[PDB]
Amino acid sequence: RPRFSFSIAAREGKARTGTIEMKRGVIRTPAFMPVGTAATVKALKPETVRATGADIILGNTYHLMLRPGAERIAKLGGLHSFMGWDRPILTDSGGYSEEGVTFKHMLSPERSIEIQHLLGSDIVMAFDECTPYPATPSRAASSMERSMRWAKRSRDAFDSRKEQAENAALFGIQQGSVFENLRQQSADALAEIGFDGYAVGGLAVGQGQDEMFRVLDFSVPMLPDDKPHYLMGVGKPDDIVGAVERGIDMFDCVLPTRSGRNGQAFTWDGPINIRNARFSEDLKPLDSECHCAVCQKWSRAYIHHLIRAGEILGAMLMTEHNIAFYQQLMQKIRDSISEGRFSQFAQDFRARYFA
Amino acid sequence: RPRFSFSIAAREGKARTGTIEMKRGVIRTPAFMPVGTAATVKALKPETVRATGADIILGNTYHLMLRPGAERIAKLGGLHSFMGWDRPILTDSGGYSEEGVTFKHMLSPERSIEIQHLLGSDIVMAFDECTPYPATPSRAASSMERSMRWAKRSRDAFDSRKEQAENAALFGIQQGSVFENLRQQSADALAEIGFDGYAVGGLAVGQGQDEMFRVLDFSVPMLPDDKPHYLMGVGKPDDIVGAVERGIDMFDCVLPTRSGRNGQAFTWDGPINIRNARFSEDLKPLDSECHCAVCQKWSRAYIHHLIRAGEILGAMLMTEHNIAFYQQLMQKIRDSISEGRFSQFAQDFRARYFA
Numbered sequence: 289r290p291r292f293s294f295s296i297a298a299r300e301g302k303a304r305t306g307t308i309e310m311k312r313g314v315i316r317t318p319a320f321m322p323v324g325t326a327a328t329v330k331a332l333k334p335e336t337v338r339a340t341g342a343d344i345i346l347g348n349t350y351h352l353m354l355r356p357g358a359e360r361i362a363k364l365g366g367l368h369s370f371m372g373w374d375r376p377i378l379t380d381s382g383g384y385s386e387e388g389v390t391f392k393h394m395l396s397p398e399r400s401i402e403i404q405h406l407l408g409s410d411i412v413m414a415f416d417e418c419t420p421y422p423a424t425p426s427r428a429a430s431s432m433e434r435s436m437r438w439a440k441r442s443r444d445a446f447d448s449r450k451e452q453a454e455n456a457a458l459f460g461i462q463q464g465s466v467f468e469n470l471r472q473q474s475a476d477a478l479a480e481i482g483f484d485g486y487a488v489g490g491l492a493v494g495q496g497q498d499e500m501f502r503v504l505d506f507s508v509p510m511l512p513d514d515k516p517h518y519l520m521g522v523g524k525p526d527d528i529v530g531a532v533e534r535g536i537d538m539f540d541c542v543l544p545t546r547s548g549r550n551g552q553a554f555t556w557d558g559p560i561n562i563r564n565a566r567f568s569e570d571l572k573p574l575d576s577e578c579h580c581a582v583c584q585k586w587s588r589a590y591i592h593h594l595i596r597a598g599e600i601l602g603a604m605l606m607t608e609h610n611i612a613f614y615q616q617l618m619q620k621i622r623d624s625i626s627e628g629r630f631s632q633f634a635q636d637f638r639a640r641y642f643a
Numbered sequence: 644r645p646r647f648s649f650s651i652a653a654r655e656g657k658a659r660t661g662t663i664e665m666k667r668g669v670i671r672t673p674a675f676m677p678v679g680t681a682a683t684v685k686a687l688k689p690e691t692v693r694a695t696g697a698d699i700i701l702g703n704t705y706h707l708m709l710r711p712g713a714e715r716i717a718k719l720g721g722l723h724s725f726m727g728w729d730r731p732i733l734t735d736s737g738g739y740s741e742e743g744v745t746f747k748h749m750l751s752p753e754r755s756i757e758i759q760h761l762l763g764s765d766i767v768m769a770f771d772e773c774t775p776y777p778a779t780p781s782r783a784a785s786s787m788e789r790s791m792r793w794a795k796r797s798r799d800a801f802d803s804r805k806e807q808a809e810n811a812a813l814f815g816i817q818q819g820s821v822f823e824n825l826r827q828q829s830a831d832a833l834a835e836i837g838f839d840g841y842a843v844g845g846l847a848v849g850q851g852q853d854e855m856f857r858v859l860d861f862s863v864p865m866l867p868d869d870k871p872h873y874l875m876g877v878g879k880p881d882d883i884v885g886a887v888e889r890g891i892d893m894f895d896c897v898l899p900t901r902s903g904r905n906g907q908a909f910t911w912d913g914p915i916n917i918r919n920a921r922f923s924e925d926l927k928p929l930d931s932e933c934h935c936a937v938c939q940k941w942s943r944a945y946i947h948h949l950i951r952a953g954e955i956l957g958a959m960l961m962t963e964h965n966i967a968f969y970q971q972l973m974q975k976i977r978d979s980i981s982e983g984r985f986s987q988f989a990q991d992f993r994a995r996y997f998a
């Protein structure tokens with residue numbers, strides 16, 4: 289199988305659908321990656337993550353390097369073996385002095401790539417220094433500047449590890465805050481280095497949806513058309529639909545998992561908090577149309593009771609439903625783009641979801 | 644199918660193995676009932692409970708009557724439907740004035756049986772007033788005395804509800820503390836009323852194993868030989884082996900579940916706390932011989948990490964392993980009795996387990 293083969297099967301406006309072929313399997317795009325914080329996707333066995341339709345999951349470099357440690361995970365066979373997920377895994381770089389960052393532990397592009405190496409990540413993220421939003425132009429470009437030099441440093445460390453280069457992929461991360469000119473300069477630096485894919489960094493904090501989207505309107509066309517576009521740490525179902533509309537191919541977010549445990553469930557008619565007393569005797573499944581295991585078996589009232597009682601089965605069922613919903617959302621986006629009816633889909637989606 | 648048909652397939656000394664046939668399925672005896680506190684067996688889907696080998700689970704009257712309430716559960720279709728377990732369910736009576744108990748809510752034999760009725764329990768427990776250990780003879784028999792009058796009251800309320808009597812079973816509960824004479828008098832009162840099965844109450848608090856066992860040595864032969872014998876709230880794997888040796892057929896306990904979440908795992912070479920740093924790099928499954936899903940897939944080191952990190956997947960895996968172990972223990976006891984080699988089994992078991 290290939291190391292990293294991105295093919296675009298269909299397009300509609302700025303949106304694309306297609307595949308990323310890797311040694312450990314294929315990734316259908318647009319793709320949602322469940323976040324497996326601490327070598328587990330909160331409350332789900334990997335078999336269940338797969339059942340919901342996920343093709344790839346995300347692991348965090350910072351978290352695992354501290355616990356149980358990178359070299360330990362390496363000695364026990366690598367992250368795939370350790371947690372029981374044999375499909376691709378993308379690791380963030382740990383990022384979210386010119387030499388790197390010291391913390392109360394040391395991180396730099398070189399250490400970051402060797403740690404992700406030790407973890408056995410399939411998709412590696414370049415080490416970066418996130419540009420806190422907001423702002424200042426000659427500040428954001430300073431921050432952006434180091435990032436770009438760090439991307440070069442990550443590229444070189446990765447390529448030196450030929451085991452890594454032959455079997456894994458390296459993604460660069462675009463910074464610039466909300467400055468069109470800082471974003472552009474980052475786009476050029478990154479494409480000048482050359483990466484397997486390009487991420488849009490810095491948009492996952494503060495910025496309402498309108499700001500985020502306006503920044504995507506000019507950022508994403510700056511990226512090489514022929515490589516995957518990954519929007520880091522986004523988002524809500526309507527954020528995803530809007531970002532795909534602006535050319536994004538990959539997503540991660542803690543939303544479905546975290547807000548699941550908190551009692552929030554995502555539905556086609558919008559999110560609901562299952563703790564609300566209105567669900568006390570509701571026999572309907574969480575969502576009238578979800579094909580998930582949970583909605584085939586349990587009612588809102590049962591899940592209402594488990595969550596209010598702080599029962600772990602509750603968190604389990606809510607998280608499985610929410611990841612299933614996100615995956616179902618990605619499948620509908622994929623199908624509608626391939627079929628050339630994604631703009632209709634986005635419209636219909638918003639009407640209902642916001643209704 | 645029958646309402647309640649107990650058959651004894653084989654015996655060895657005081658021990659028996661056989662079946663209890665009920666409308667919703669068959670119960671293999673000696674039987675371990677996972678405790679499904681709050682309409683869930685902590686951290687497990689019912690399908691997983693079934694996978695481990697459980698034939699019946701236990702629900703608590705006191706807990707569910709307060710949340711989400713008995714009449715509500717009745718309106719939503721009954722406990723089986725509500726929680727997604729279609730096999731038998733035994734409900735405790737809520738027990739653990741002459742008219743009943745008031746609490747900061749009202750409970751009496753009549754209310755207890757109607758609540759278990761509303762829940763749709765398969766096996767109903769008579770309402771009792773547990774004889775706190777220790778003791779005083781003319782006190783324990785006072786407490787025992789009310790219990791016996793309450794058992795009569797439970798018998799009558801149950802039989803008046805003909806929907807209940809035609810489809811469910813009623814168990815009486817033997818009290819007496821550690822007094823051989825109070826136990827005997829309770830045995831006679833109960834058998835004079837007549838129940839489908841007989842429980843040994845009051846032995847699940849304080850009493851070390853030796854005391855518990857000496858009390859079983861004279862209590863259990865007092866019970867009708869031809870009905871099931873249920874030891875309430877027991878216990879550790881070695882407690883179960885010892886009680887079966889003294890004629891017990893049914894068990895419940897929070898041990899496998901609760902101590903699972905706390906990081907304790909049961910093995911054939913004894914319990915272990917997976918949090919211990921000695922498991923940090925242990926690639927072995929939790930138990931070298933367990934046939935459970937968990938031990939087929941994950942290592943001690945992975946589960947070590949999840950539990951120390953407070954990850955829900957950890958509690959899930961540990962609870963599934965522990966319930967699987969208990970069920971595997973019951974199967975080995977059943978097979979060895981049928982095969983007439985249970986005393987050898989008990990011996991071999993103790994050597995290893997305590998080794």
Ligand SMILES: Nc1nc2[nH]cnc2c(=O)[nH]1
Pocket residue numbers: 380381382383384413416418419461488489490491492520521
């Ligand atoms: N490494 C990294 N991770 C993120 N997660 C969300 N935003 C970012 C970012 O800009 N960089």
Ligand SMILES: Nc1nc2[nH]cnc2c(=O)[nH]1
Pocket residue numbers: 735736737738739768771773774816843844845846847875876
């Ligand atoms: N109802 C009841 N439940 C118990 N659980 C443990 N012991 C007892 C008992 O004596 N009565």
Ligand SMILES: [Zn+2]
Pocket residue numbers: 574575578579580581582583584609612613
């Ligand atoms: Zn669902």
Ligand SMILES: [Zn+2]
Pocket residue numbers: 929930933934935936937938939964967968
């Ligand atoms: Zn096991």
